[PDB]
């Protein structure tokens, strides 16, 4: 059965993904976006009392301006969550959100709280990814300065595994294709929390779909794009790279015991967690070391996993990871079935929990038992989580 202290995911909710460049969230702050989301998710789960929330752990990377000073607490204060609850912001670059979930999970397992709210956010429109970045000169004495430029790390991982321009463009076409399909078929209806935004004309209205998706993306349209990081020989382009998006993700997590008491059916249960490091230069490879450690902790083999969510940082880093994870031939059967970051965007702080949320819904919809969410992390890291639907 489920032990009292096992970690249960009660529900998952995310905002519609908006284009940072003039998109739907252009007039919405990161704190407000986070509060609104938290508020709505808690509203759909009326049996979970906000006062019971021990901690609000939020993932966010560029913590300055709208996102500085512990945005997790700033957002909580504008929610039905009482002042008596705590809140902390976590940063592990791309994996911030997943780390948020792990910290709450671990807190639940050790008896330091029963109910938590995790998630993350990143409004790249208001706090661009290169905003306030000050390279440390001394770093060049231990690693390559170029390792800090994600695009170049994709180029390197790609050349090293021989991922062609065609292979990358194909993955991208599939991503938009599958994201659009899922949208149209209402596969994102349960996880997407409708939200107010603005259209190109500044008109106020509600959005319940991801703007980022581009259904008109074909091999032909992508072939016309030029390399984005290596003018002479590069294969990575804007079309096969994750988008600059504005978004937030959220999850209600609690001990199994509390879930039993409240009489609510778990969306899933956590079976294992893991982080790991790799060289900064090939950060995109982070998922394989992390996934291996997590699978071992879960007592499972890659084959036991029914569905996989691998963040699509770059097709150039996703494809190699899938091959080395030994599931490339199983791609269309269990990998990013509803599209990925190339079509859905990669708002740093938000992604960790986001792909995990989408995974849970993919598992629910396709009768999966075990799921794996994993992603590469800038500056050489990988993080992974194993979920079980029981």
């Amino acid at each position: 059965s489920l032990n009292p202290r096992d970690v249960v995911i009660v529900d998952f909710g995310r905002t519609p993904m908006g284009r940072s460049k003039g998109g739907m969230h252009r007039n919405t702050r990161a704190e407000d976006m986070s509060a609104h989301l938290i508020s709505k998710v808690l509203e759909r789960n009326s049996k979970v009392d906000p006062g019971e929330v021990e901690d609000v752990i939020w993932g966010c990377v560029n913590q300055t301006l709208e996102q500085g000073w512990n945005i997790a607490r700033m957002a909580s204060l504008m929610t039905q969550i009482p002042h008596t609850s705590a809140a902390q912001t976590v940063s592990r670059l791309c994996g911030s959100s997943m780390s948020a979930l792990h910290t709450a999970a671990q807190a639940i397992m050790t008896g330091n709280g029963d109910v938590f709210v995790v998630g993350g956010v990143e409004h790249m429109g208001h706090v661009s990814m290169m905003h306030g970045v000050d390279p440390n000169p001394h770093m060049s004495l231990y690693a390559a300065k170029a390792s800090g430029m994600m695009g170049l790390t994709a180029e390197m991982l790609g050349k090293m595994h021989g991922i062609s321009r065609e292979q990358q463009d194909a993955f991208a076409v599939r991503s938009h294709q599958l994201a659009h399909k899922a949208t149209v078929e209402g596969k994102f209806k349960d996880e997407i929390i409708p939200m107010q935004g603005y259209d190109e004309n500044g008109f106020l209205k509600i959005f319940d779909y991801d703007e980022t998706i581009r259904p008109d993306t074909t091999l032909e349209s992508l072939a016309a794009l030029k390399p984005a990081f290596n003018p002479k020989g590069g294969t990575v382009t804007a079309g096969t790279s994750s988008q600059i998006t504005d978004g937030a993700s959220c999850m209600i997590v609690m001990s199994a015991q509390r879930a039993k008491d409240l009489g609510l059916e778990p969306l899933a249960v956590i079976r294992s967690m893991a982080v790991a490091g790799v060289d900064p230069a090939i950060m995109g490879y982070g998922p394989v070391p992390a996934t291996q450690k997590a699978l071992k902790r879960a007592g499972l083999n890659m084959a036991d996993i029914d569905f996989i969510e691998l963040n699509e940082a770059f097709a150039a880093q996703a494809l190699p990871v899938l091959k080395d994870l030994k599931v490339l031939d199983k791609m269309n059967e269990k990998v990013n079935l509803h599209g990925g970051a190339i079509a859905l965007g990669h708002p740093f702080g938000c992604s960790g929990a986001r792909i995990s949320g989408t995974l849970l819904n993919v598992m629910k919809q396709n009768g999966g038992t075990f799921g794996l969410s994993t992603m590469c992390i800038g500056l050489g890291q990988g993080i992974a989580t194993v979920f079980e639907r029981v």
Partner: protein
């Protein structure tokens, strides 16, 4: 004095500390011409032989620290057959290395411009204290060449590949402020305190407060970078 030449002098100071000063008599600047290199050889051997020496301060008596030799000598030197040129540089480098291998703490007091060979002399020391008005850099690429006195060896092991490449491939002059940020230098002070700062620093090295051996070590071994990080760094640099 311990050593008295026409370009270099080595005068004894307090507590066994010794000062090797560059002052090319009759000329407006210091530069590594044939004469100076030969005298450095002698000054080094003199210090290397004086068992009472407890530390060395390298300074300048001119407005500049040390600049490059006359373009004239560059032209001549580059006409020599590869074997001779390389043998001549092996010899010059042996001098700087010997100064670097002194079993005593060394500090370079950069009072003014230190370009090419001048900077290379500074890189050979354990510590470098620079006046906030001075400038340093390796302009070798301007002449179609690159550092020839250990510059490509010492700078990368001192400030990191990316930064060394930036300095060497551009040959730009660097201000005190920037030199401190990349750690090409260890302290920046006003012109009036350069002497005192160098004297103060040397004593802390002698007392063991500052581990001069550990600070020197990095330029006597391989870079710290991974085979992986190396590839990333060099390939992007070339690109």
């Amino acid at each position: 004095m311990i050593y008295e030449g026409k370009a270099i002098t080595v005068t004894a100071l307090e507590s066994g500390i010794v000062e090797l000063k560059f002052d090319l008599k009759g000329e407006s600047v210091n530069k590594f011409n044939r004469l100076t290199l030969n005298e450095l050889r002698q000054a080094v051997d003199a210090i290397k032989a004086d068992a009472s020496v407890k530390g060395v301060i390298v300074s300048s008596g001119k407005d500049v620290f040390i600049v490059g030799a006359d373009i004239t000598e560059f032209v001549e030197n580059f006409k020599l057959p590869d074997a001779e040129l390389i043998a001549g540089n092996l010899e010059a480098n042996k001098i700087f290395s010997d100064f670097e291998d002194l079993n005593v703490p060394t500090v370079a007091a950069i009072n003014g411009i230190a370009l090419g060979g001048g900077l290379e002399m500074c890189l050979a020391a354990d510590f470098r204290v620079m006046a906030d008005s001075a400038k340093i850099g390796l302009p070798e690429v301007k002449l179609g060449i690159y550092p020839g006195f250990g510059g490509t060896v010492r700078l990368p092991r001192l400030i990191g590949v990316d930064n060394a490449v930036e300095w060497i491939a551009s040959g730009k002059e660097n201000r005190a402020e920037d030199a401190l940020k990349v750690s090409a230098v260890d302290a920046v002070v006003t012109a009036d305190k350069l002497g005192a700062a160098a004297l103060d620093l040397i004593k802390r090295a002698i007392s063991g407060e500052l581990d001069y051996k550990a600070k020197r070590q990095p330029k006597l071994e391989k870079l710290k970078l991974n085979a992986i990080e190396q590839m990333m760094a060099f390939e992007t640099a070339k690109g």
